[PDB]
Amino acid sequence: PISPIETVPVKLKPGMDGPKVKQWPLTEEKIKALVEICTEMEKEGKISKIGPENPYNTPVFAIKKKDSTKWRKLVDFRELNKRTQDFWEVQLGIPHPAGLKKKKSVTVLDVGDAYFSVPLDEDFRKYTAFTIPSINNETPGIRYQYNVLPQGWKGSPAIFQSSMTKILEPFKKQNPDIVIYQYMDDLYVGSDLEIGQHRTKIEELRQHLLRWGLTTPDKKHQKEPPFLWMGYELHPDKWTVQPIVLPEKDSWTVNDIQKLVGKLNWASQIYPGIKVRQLSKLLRGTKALTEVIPLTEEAELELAENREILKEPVHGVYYDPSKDLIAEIQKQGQGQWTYQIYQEPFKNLKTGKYARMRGAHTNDVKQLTEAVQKITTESIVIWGKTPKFKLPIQKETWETWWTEYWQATWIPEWEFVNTPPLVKLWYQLEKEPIVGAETFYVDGAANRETKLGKAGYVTNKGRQKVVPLTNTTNQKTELQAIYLALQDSGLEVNIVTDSQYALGIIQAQPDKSESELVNQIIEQLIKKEKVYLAWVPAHKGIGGNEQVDKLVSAGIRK
Amino acid sequence: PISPIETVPVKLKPGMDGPKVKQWPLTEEKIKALVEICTEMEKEGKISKIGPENPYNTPVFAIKKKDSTKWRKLVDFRELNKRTQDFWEVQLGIPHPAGLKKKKSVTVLDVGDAYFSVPLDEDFRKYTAFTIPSINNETPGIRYQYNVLPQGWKGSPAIFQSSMTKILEPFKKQNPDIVIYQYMDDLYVGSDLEIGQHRTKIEELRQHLLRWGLTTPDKKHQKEPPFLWMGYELHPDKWTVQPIVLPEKDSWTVNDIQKLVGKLNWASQIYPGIKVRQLSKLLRGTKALTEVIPLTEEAELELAENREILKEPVHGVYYDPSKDLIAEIQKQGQGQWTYQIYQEPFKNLKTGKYARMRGAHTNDVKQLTEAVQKITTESIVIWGKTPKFKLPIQKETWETWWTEYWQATWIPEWEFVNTPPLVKLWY
Ligand SMILES: CC(C)=CCN1Cc2cc(Cl)cc3[nH]c(=S)n(c23)C[C@@H]1C
């Protein structure tokens, strides 16, 4: 029958009128078959006949399905659907397992065809009328119309899941001891009642739902021991993602390169190490999903190293509001960093990583933060609290970044714990020019039209030099010109830059970059005792910078 | 209670749907701080529970408006506003008192509790839909709609405007000298009487409001002999530019004269009146960044002539009412914040430096968020509108902790500039 629930007012878009999707005359062998299944739905009262004053129509196709020992009905109103108002989002948000607390038993119930138990606005049913012919050329319209939430119509999923949450309102009051969570047409119930005692309630609810059409034949609640949902696998005290099968073969194309870098990432929720720099790096191949990609030596290193991990599987534990969430972050790769959250001594709750795709020159202390940050942003979202942080870094290191970094960053709870690559500052510039030191009035340009210019510099002591560098462009030259000033110079040198980019990059005390032009400066700044970058603009009447500007004319006349 | 009334039929702008922003996820201490509120709020009849048919949304946050007092709601009405009161900026536009800025002392009161009466057309309620969340998208959240006057909305003081002009009549009679701008949900009242007297006139108004229409002011103080909430005693009559001063280094070391010549030239854009030539000439000559260099006599004149020209300001101090104003803040050092409200580059209508030393409660995502409201009140007073910000902060860090420290009632629109400084020097 139909669950008598307070109906909710669905409407069509303003100015718009219901469907007229007429249909190409159906299969007689399946047209009668429309009557031999509809009549059941009609006597079940879900389908009622009319014919004269309601013009609207839609498509009633018919088909068969999985292990069908019977013929099936089909009428997707994706026409009417777009001519149907917009509803509340079904559900954006997935109860990611790790957040879940342990309830002693949790059945899962099929919510059958609970769509038809619920009804449809007595007005919005006119726009649901469909049509069935009889013989290629015989009977005059056998028109039916819907009374209950049809099976494909923008609103059902919501009007539906609204209704149910109403239908489970009393029971959820009287039972403030047994959690429920709908899922499309499923219901996870989960008390702390011991097996059977739990069986008492599923049975009560089952009967409750039985009153207003929510027939739940999930006998004593059919509940497969493990849980695949959303690709998860849920157990009474553990969750995961079991079937992650990183394929192995020869032609590794963009399409599969992606897929390979999908599972891999997915796996990271629980697998304490899964790296994905390399494979993702090359993965930036555009338009050629079908075209093969040469899995590079390092992208190979990653692929199976992970396999090593991904064979030895992992069990994820459930949340328990007795303890503060704890956070450990350690850097594994290069751009790569990792974090796993626990509150108890050592069986995992959650795991994840943070890889930099900032642009081209990000610092390392900064880089801890962004990771840290991501976790707060994630814990807030799941557990509604904030991991106390534990991070490989003296405050001596941290506090020196904010007292001197421009953008600001805020750091919640965090305790230091010694581990391997200790997060720190390798080189630190000065404030005042180092006294007496050889002042390098550097420069290095190159022609736009001719990628080849010449880095070089000029010291206080008439000490010039220059280096012809091909395949260059101003940018790659004002840095190159710094490096050189960093080579023929003492252990305590001052430097004058024409550029900004250059003074930008170095001034931010960055460490790793993937190129040797920048990188080499870093390792020169590191081994050193007292650099001093400084900027005065080009051709700014700065004769001091003028010479550096005219110096290079021994490789271009102008 | 049962005391209904006429509805100013409210509507949208041309061709637009309602706000459909999505509810940012908030804490546990908070998801409850709102369930209670909102749940008081249904008994009270202000808000109602809704169904699917309504698919709009507006973020609801939660804060503690008095030195961390009691939980209070804070709908981010930033998107339904544009989607209504911009066409309503014209229909019921509460006029801006350009003399308020001049009053030697100002005070701000929360007349927002008042709107709480006027019912809203059930043809518009649809759009104030709001949503309170759950910890891990487990519970589908509680969905409410507004039945009175969405108190966050830029079109509510506008509706409940007449009712205010009225409740404010005798105050204006008695004291026809105090200004009263009614922006959003606050009333800036400006007097020009003895430090303590301005406060006097205010307890008065906080009281005349009271007895009359149940509109309630807020108990700024009692006997409370503690150093909490010094007071919102603004004084909009002060705002001048000068600490963009050149360090006068009688030890003109080259390095010194270098940076100096440096700054000086950027000024050429902000102050078309700059001619740093014969000064540059002094640095012409690869030399040690630690020596002296103060020659070109005529250049020295350039040092005074500029040092003094920095006092006679730009053309761009012209407000163009069809130009949204931009505020840019800058971590200048430890505590010292800075900002400059402009509309067209270098033509800046206002500058200043927000000061609150670290060590105390240095949360950078505090001194700024605080410095985002000050700067933003500084504009209700003046230009009568809030500036879109450029925030020296990671989108996220800010989206995480703004709502803690936000004690305010409105929310300026913003943007975080991962883009560095040239300006973060001494300015
Ligand atoms: C994740 C989904 C669909 C949950 C629905 N569902 C069942 C479930 C299943 C396991 Cl293995 C642990 C669980 N822990 C909690 S709390 N729940 C839970 C309750 C909700 C009511």
A454, two tokens: 């010449």
Three-class secondary structure assignment of A434-489 = CCCCCEECCECCCCCCCCEEEEEECCCCCCCEEEEEECCCCHHHHCHHHHHHCCCC
A101 lines ligand 1 (CB under 6 A): yes
- Residue among A99, A439, A537 minimizing CB distance to B135: A99
B31 to A89: CB separation less than 8 angstroms, yes or no: no
Tell which residue, A479, A472, A481, has the closest CA to residue A518.
A479
Instruction: Beginning with the edge strand found earlier in the chain, give each strand of the sheet holding A533-535 in spatial order.
Output: A439-440, A494-497, A533-535
Residue A160, Cβ density class (10 Å: 0-12 exposed, 13-18 middle, ≥19 buried) = buried
What domain count does chain B have? Answer: 4
Provide the CATH number for the domain around residue B55. Answer: 3.10.10.10
Torsion angle (degrees, nearest 10) of CA A524, A526, A528, A531: 80
Residue A456, Cβ density class (10 Å: 0-12 exposed, 13-18 middle, ≥19 buried) = buried
A106 lines ligand 1 (CB under 6 A): yes
A223 lines ligand 1 (CB under 6 A): no
Residue A135, Cβ density class (10 Å: 0-12 exposed, 13-18 middle, ≥19 buried) = exposed
β-partners of residue A191 are: A105, A178
8 A C-beta contact, residue B262 and residue A537: yes
Which residues of chain A lie closer than 8 angstroms to B329, CB-CB?
A: none
A238 lines ligand 1 (CB under 6 A): no
8 A C-beta contact, residue B329 and residue B393: no
Method of determination? X-ray
E strand or H helix at B347, and its extent?
strand B347-352
**Domain limit, last residue, from B206, B238, B270:** B238
How many CB atoms sit inside 10 A of residue A47's CB? 22
A266 lines ligand 1 (CB under 6 A): no
Pocket test for ligand 1, best of A91, A94, A96, A100 (most atoms within 8 A of CB): A100
Same domain, B31 and B145: yes
A100 lines ligand 1 (CB under 6 A): yes
As a whole number of angstroms, the distance between CA B190 and CA B108 comes to 9
8 A C-beta contact, residue B144 and residue B59: no
- What is the largest distance, in Å, between two alpha-carbon atoms of chain A? 107
Single-letter amino acid, residue A19: P
Task: Quote the minimal CA–CA distance from A46 to chain B in Å.
Answer: 22
Same domain, B172 and B62: no
Resolution in angstroms for this experimental structure?
3.0
Burial B325-336 (b: 16+ CB within 10 A, else e): bbbbbbbbbebb
**Domain limit, last residue, from B299, B316, B333:** B316
Which residues of chain B lie closer than 8 angstroms to A165, CB-CB?
A: 140
As a whole number of angstroms, the distance between CA A276 and CA A305 comes to 11
Same domain, B264 and B203: no
Q: Where are the beta strands (DSSP E) in B302-338?
A: 326-328
As a whole number of angstroms, the distance between CA A509 and CA A503 comes to 10
8 A C-beta contact, residue B55 and residue B113: no
Same domain, B103 and B196: yes
Provide the CATH number for the domain around residue B260. Answer: 3.30.70.270
Task: Quote the minimal CA–CA distance from A543 to chain B in Å.
Answer: 4
Classified as helix, coil or strand, B373 is: helix
As a whole number of angstroms, the distance between CA B75 and CA B60 comes to 4
Burial B170-192 (b: 16+ CB within 10 A, else e): ebeeeeeebbbbbbbbbbbbbbe
Structural domains of chain A, with CATH:
1-90+116-156 (3.10.10.10), 91-115+157-225 (3.30.70.270), 226-319 (3.30.70.270), 320-426 (3.30.70.270), 427-558 (3.30.420.10)
- Residue among A10, A433, A541 minimizing CB distance to B280: A541
| DSSP letter for each residue of A80-121 | HHHTB-----S------GGGPBP-SEEEEEE-TTHHHHSB--
As a whole number of angstroms, the distance between CA A166 and CA A179 comes to 15
β-partners of residue B146 are: B47
Tokens 């290193």 correspond to A301
As a whole number of angstroms, the distance between CA A116 and CA A160 comes to 9
Burial B365-385 (b: 16+ CB within 10 A, else e): bbbbbbbbbebbbbbbbbbbe
As a whole number of angstroms, the distance between CA A525 and CA B339 comes to 34
Cα first-last separation, chain B? 55
Distances (CA, A) of A449 to A259, A471, A500: 41, 11, 22
As a whole number of angstroms, the distance between CA A83 and CA A19 comes to 7
As a whole number of angstroms, the distance between CA B381 and CA B55 comes to 37
Tell which residue, A341, A334, A339, has the closest CA to residue A276.
A334
* Residue B186 marked as a ligand binder: yes
Same domain, B43 and B137: yes
Alpha helices, DSSP H, located in B110-253: 112-115, 156-159, 162-167, 169-174, 195-213
Backbone angles phi, psi at A240, to 5 degrees: -175, -155
Chain-centroid distance of CA B371 in Å reads: 9
Interface test with B, best of A106, A410, A509 (most B CBs within 10 A): A410
Same domain, B250 and B353: no
Task: Name the closest residue on chain B to residue A84, using Cα atoms.
Answer: B53
Distances (CA, A) of A90 to A9, A73, A86, B273: 16, 25, 11, 61
Tell which residue, A192, A50, A185, has the closest CA to residue A128.
A50
* Residue A443 marked as a ligand binder: yes
A408 to B364: CB separation less than 8 angstroms, yes or no: yes
CA of A106 to the centre of ligand 1 (A): 7
Same domain, B143 and B42: yes
CA of A230 to the centre of ligand 1 (A): 12
Same domain, B143 and B67: yes
Q: What is the DSSP letter of B3?
A: -
B160, two tokens: 């409940």
As a whole number of angstroms, the distance between CA A242 and CA B304 comes to 76
Alpha helices, DSSP H, located in B168-274: 169-174, 195-213, 254-270
| DSSP letter for each residue of A172-228 | HHH-TTEEEEEETTEEEEEES--TTHHHHHHHHHHHHHHHTT----STT----SS--
A502 lines ligand 1 (CB under 6 A): no
Torsion angle (degrees, nearest 10) of CA A471, A476, A478, A480: -80
E strand or H helix at A499, and its extent?
none
Same domain, B355 and B408: yes
* Residue A237 marked as a ligand binder: no
Query: Which residues 6+ apart lie within 8 Å of B265 measured at CB?
Result: A537, A540, B274, B276
As a whole number of angstroms, the distance between CA A157 and CA A174 comes to 26
As a whole number of angstroms, the distance between CA B263 and CA A385 comes to 47
Query: Which residues 6+ apart lie within 8 Å of A393 measured at CB?
Result: A365, A368, A416, A422, A423, A424
Tell which residue, A29, A7, A155, has the closest CA to residue A80.
A155
As a whole number of angstroms, the distance between CA A519 and CA A535 comes to 20
Tokens 């509803």 correspond to A87
8 A C-beta contact, residue B411 and residue B78: yes
Distances (CA, A) of B326 to A254, B267, B269, B418: 44, 20, 18, 16
Q: Number of residue pairs across A and B with CB atoms under 8 Å?
A: 168
* Residue B364 marked as a ligand binder: no
Same domain, B2 and B147: yes
8 A C-beta contact, residue B57 and residue B46: no
8 A C-beta contact, residue A495 and residue A440: yes
As a whole number of angstroms, the distance between CA B382 and CA B368 comes to 20
Task: Quote the minimal CA–CA distance from A116 to chain B in Å.
Answer: 18
Same domain, B13 and B147: yes
Single-letter amino acid, residue A264: L
Q: What is the DSSP letter of A335?
A: S
Tell which residue, B147, B137, B214, B201, has the closest CA to residue B174.
B201
A190, two tokens: 């989960």
Tell which residue, A447, A389, A452, A459, has the closest CA to residue A417.
A389
8 A C-beta contact, residue A184 and residue A38: no
Alpha helices, DSSP H, located in B284-363: 297-309
Pocket test for ligand 1, best of A181, A185, A349 (most atoms within 8 A of CB): A181
Same domain, B363 and B384: yes
Q: Give the domain extent around B150.
A: 1-94+116-156
Query: Which residues 6+ apart lie within 8 Å of A417 measured at CB?
Result: A328, A390, A391, A392
Task: Name the closest residue on chain A to residue B425, using Cα atoms.
Answer: A406
**Domain limit, last residue, from B221, B238, B255:** B238
Breaks in chain B, after residue numbers (C to N greater than 2.5 Å): none
